[PDB]
Amino acid sequence: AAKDVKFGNDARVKMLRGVNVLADAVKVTLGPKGRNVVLDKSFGAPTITKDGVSVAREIELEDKFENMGAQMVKEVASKANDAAGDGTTTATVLAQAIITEGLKAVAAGMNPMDLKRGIDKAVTAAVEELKALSVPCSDSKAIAQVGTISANSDETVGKLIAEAMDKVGKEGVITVEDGTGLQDELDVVEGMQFDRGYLSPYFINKPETGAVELESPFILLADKKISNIREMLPVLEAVAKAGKPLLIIAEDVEGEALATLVVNTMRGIVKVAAVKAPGFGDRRKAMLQDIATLTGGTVISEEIGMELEKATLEDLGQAKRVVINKDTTTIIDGVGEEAAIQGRVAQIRQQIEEATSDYDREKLQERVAKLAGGVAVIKVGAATEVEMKEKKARVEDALHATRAAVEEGVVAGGGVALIRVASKLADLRGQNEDQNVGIKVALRAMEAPLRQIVLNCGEEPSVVANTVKGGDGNYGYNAATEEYGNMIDMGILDPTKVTRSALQYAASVAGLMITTECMVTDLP
Amino acid sequence: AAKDVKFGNDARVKMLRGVNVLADAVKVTLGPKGRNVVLDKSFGAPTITKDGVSVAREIELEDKFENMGAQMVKEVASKANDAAGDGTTTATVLAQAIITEGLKAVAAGMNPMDLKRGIDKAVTAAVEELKALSVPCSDSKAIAQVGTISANSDETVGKLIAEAMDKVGKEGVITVEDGTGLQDELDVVEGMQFDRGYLSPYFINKPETGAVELESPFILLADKKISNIREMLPVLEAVAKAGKPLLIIAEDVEGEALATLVVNTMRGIVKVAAVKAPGFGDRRKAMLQDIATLTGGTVISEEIGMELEKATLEDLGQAKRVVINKDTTTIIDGVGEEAAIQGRVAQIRQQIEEATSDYDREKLQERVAKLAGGVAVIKVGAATEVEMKEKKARVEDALHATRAAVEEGVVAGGGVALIRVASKLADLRGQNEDQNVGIKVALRAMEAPLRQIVLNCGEEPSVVANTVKGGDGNYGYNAATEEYGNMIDMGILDPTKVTRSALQYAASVAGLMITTECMVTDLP
Amino acid sequence: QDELDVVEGMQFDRGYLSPYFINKPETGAVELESPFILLADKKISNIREMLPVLEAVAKAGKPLLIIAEDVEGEALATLVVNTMRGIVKVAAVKAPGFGDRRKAMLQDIATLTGGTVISEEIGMELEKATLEDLGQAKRVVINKDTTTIIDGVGEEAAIQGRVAQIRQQIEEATSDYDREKLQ
Amino acid sequence: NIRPLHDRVIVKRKEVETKSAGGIVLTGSAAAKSTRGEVLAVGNGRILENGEVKPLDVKVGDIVIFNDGYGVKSEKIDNEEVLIMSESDILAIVEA
Ligand SMILES: Nc1ncnc2c1ncn2[C@@H]1O[C@H](COP(=O)(O)OP(=O)(O)OP(=O)(O)O)[C@@H](O)[C@H]1O
Ligand SMILES: Nc1ncnc2c1ncn2[C@@H]1O[C@H](COP(=O)(O)OP(=O)(O)OP(=O)(O)O)[C@@H](O)[C@H]1O
Ligand SMILES: [Mg+2]
């Protein structure tokens, strides 16, 4: 359609006004004293959130040029959320500070491309400085502190996440979901717990618990769905001769086969429970092979070559215990070679590395947790739905922050880490004076998180920033207690990945925005 | 619909205003000091770009007559992008300068047709002068300089592109795609790397790498899809007698045949891996013939005459090594006659010459690269998606400019080449005075790129233009360092094809637009 | 620059039905020197219709060019295999145009090459086609796009009569497209 | 070795004619399966209703023109294909 074209300073002013609107919406949620934001939803009740990414996503302005600026700087929060999972408000705070100071230099005749180059140089040096300044975050206490700081100073969330990571270890998978009660709960399940219930209620060995319980049973694994009995007379008869119970994993057991198995279940000749194979195409086979390796069995399939009629006891897998309910199937201490399990988990790790989709890698990690370590579910407890949504957002932020902390270490929280990095980068120089001005605007913007935290506290950002810069090391400002002290000893830790991602994404998008001279949009 | 008709100077003024709007949007992105332009997108985030063609494409004005001028002069950037892949901002700068100076002569009573003739004569002489003034660009250093200049003074991009065409030679194919990391990466694959994975995971000889590996195997090439085993019993049996592994290329292998091949792969009688035939209708046959020629085999097809049952070892192709993964299959050192490969690549070259579609010639050149030389993929590394788009646009510009440099040579950059060409054409005369005025407006407009670069730097365009015209040869202005020197020795090279195409398309469109007297459009 | 491309004689835009007919791989063009030309109004897919024609052509030894509504399947396979085997040099290309036009220009090709069109309506069958039925041309060149017949051996009087008839159709035609096609 | 029972014949079908009469190579359905084949084995003979077995008129080693259908069965012996068909399915015998 017909375009409105704006040039130079007026375009930059409109872009900055949009960036300021988005960042003002986002940055009132920075720190422990940061407040909440109400996002009106077209469907349902308004959302009360403190995440900067949500506020950034919701912001869209009437003016087309201001909206362009808003979307461009919203990219910072979106990328910071996608990469690190936390630090979206800090990323938006850093981006606007680079933009505001970068646009001031652009207005002073400085070359914006060289300003972008200087900002990039300063941020590369800053990332190196952060990697040097980080410390490993391995003990449970530091993880609890990271989770607490990332959950808006909620100690229970941090302790719960530390417990979850201790229980599921390194290879376990932790997910967060809604809870019924008013208190957060942790549900940790080890070994295999794929969500497939019994195909028939009559298999239930313990009616009081409504759960089939098999002690040291055989496990048959068939890739194909079965409806006739004629395929498994050898297997079932040999199981009866052995006398140990049997659990059937298959694409589908129904009709004559299911009725026969139920009849023999009451008759007591065999204790057989049949549950569906977990997953779907190209996934059911993978996790069936995983179950076979864990239980020391072999999968019966047409493609592999073997047939059910020729299946024997050695083909069937073995496990210490099997528990079946309406929803889930649990296998306890599958009798399988540790070398095979480690090899399979190594293969799944290779698939993780070669995977390019988040859903795929999370599914592969879930499979790993099924094989080695465990799966933890944190049920968030809240009185209402708005409280549930806000607390779940905070718990997910804490989960991502703890994961980033174990991945890349921790640094002093409250913006102290970037203050120290900026202090250590005071000797950095570019190729010309425009690049040095860009380095200086990056270094000044590195103080924006701390200043905005303090401003959210109601204190003086300049006073506290000067006092923190006067110190050294981990000396910073606890905004919750409004007192100066060692950031690590006070338990205020930021993941190094979170800070680095915020700084990098803010710097990239902000430099690109400050390099702009013309802006083309649609007419109002 | 009802038309608004504008005559003479009113129409010319509105057309010029539209041209000025489009060219002002485009030309703020000229030179090393040229800035960026934000283009609002109806879907997604706004695009920050420095290409002139993107800005030109986005420009559409409210006024119908100004919009007519804008579209007409946007065609200059579109054609320059389609032909050379670079010089779109220079083409738009030249076009507007020819239009502005052409319309001044038209207002002074000169005959616009003779002005068009004079501009065309001057540009023909200028193209001859450029062809004479060009120098070959064959070494890697000049290629690095060309890529660096075309990537907005990004030395890493130029060096990466120079390395890419050093590795893939003249016949290789270089393409640019998104990367995951923060650094640009180069992935060069030689011989055949058609993107077809194994038809079944069970073929994998090396589970740790998840890749089937065959050492000096046979290659069967069937044009028809196969689902039964009986057709290739002679082939598989004879391969088993040979003992070497077998790789199957076919339209589709499935069902009983696939199960049989898998079972024998476990049994170890024959090491068989079957992957799908690359390409599609009328293309899959071409790729199969190329693979047969490279591997010294013959394609089994119904149309060719022979059948799979009569296929023999001499029919089957041979290769030194074969690797297969989930995605791609690579054949290393296919045992084939060099004369046959040279003949096949010559045939593909003739198909390139006879081809009229860009996609078709790109596919044929990719096939050539598969046969001779290699294929390189430049993965652009950027922190965000917007930086990804900007850097990928710059890298594609650099790739196109390096290709144009190897095709037609290089000239002094920074507008010096056109300045020198205009200096060498001061003695050019037409048939009458209107044609000489047109020649003069073309020669004056030949100084527009340098003046616009300098103006983008903030310096005085007239001062630097006079200083550059005072010099000779390759003496010009480095706008990045704001210093005078030899453009070739300073590493500022423009592809001769880029400059020639910009000048030619700008001249053609601009002369046509200055010949206009009436303008008919729809009423607002 | 403006270019002029002038093609004489018959150059209807129909390429080979199979790439394997190509005698000259460097140019990608089938080249037949003084070949027979078979012209069939019906599309063919079997082989049993032209064993007499193909065998007699192989006995003669001169190459063969087939113009037909469509040659496909077993017919193309047989002709291609015979082309590699060298028994007969056969190139089959589709008849040009469509209904009420393909017949007209096939009759034109027959007159130019001194042949007779094989059709159901005309009466004869492909099995009874003979060498005298088949047309003759001095040269034939086939590419992916165009088929060209050079110096078709045909009676001059027949050619002038046919062009006179086409001129009468031009006079009786009332549509610009029709007269353009006739010209 | 395989020999038939009662009125049945084991025949080895001849190879389909690759080339036509004039030297044209036939491929696909053009070179259709030949209906003539040499007789490999002759059964004891057809049994009549009265109980007497009369020998089949065909002889071992004689090419016979036979009819494909439900009567003929394609068995494999020593990786080779043999047609087992009733003597009634044998239309003719090829001599000279
Ligand atoms: N008690 C505290 N004293 C000082 N700084 C604190 C305190 N608690 C948290 N912070 C700091 O608050 C900063 C950001 O907090 P917050 O969780 O609001 O934002 P974020 O992680 O950048 O974004 P998000 O809104 O997406 O969670 C961190 O740098 C952290 O160190
Ligand atoms: N350091 C430099 N000093 C002088 N001139 C330079 C320098 N770097 C680049 N140039 C000149 O800038 C001109 C155009 O640069 P630019 O890449 O912005 O535009 P373009 O190639 O015309 O178009 P596009 O915007 O489509 O890439 C070229 O003529 C080139 O010689
Ligand atoms: Mg947070």
Ligand SMILES: [Mg+2]
């Ligand atoms: Mg360029």
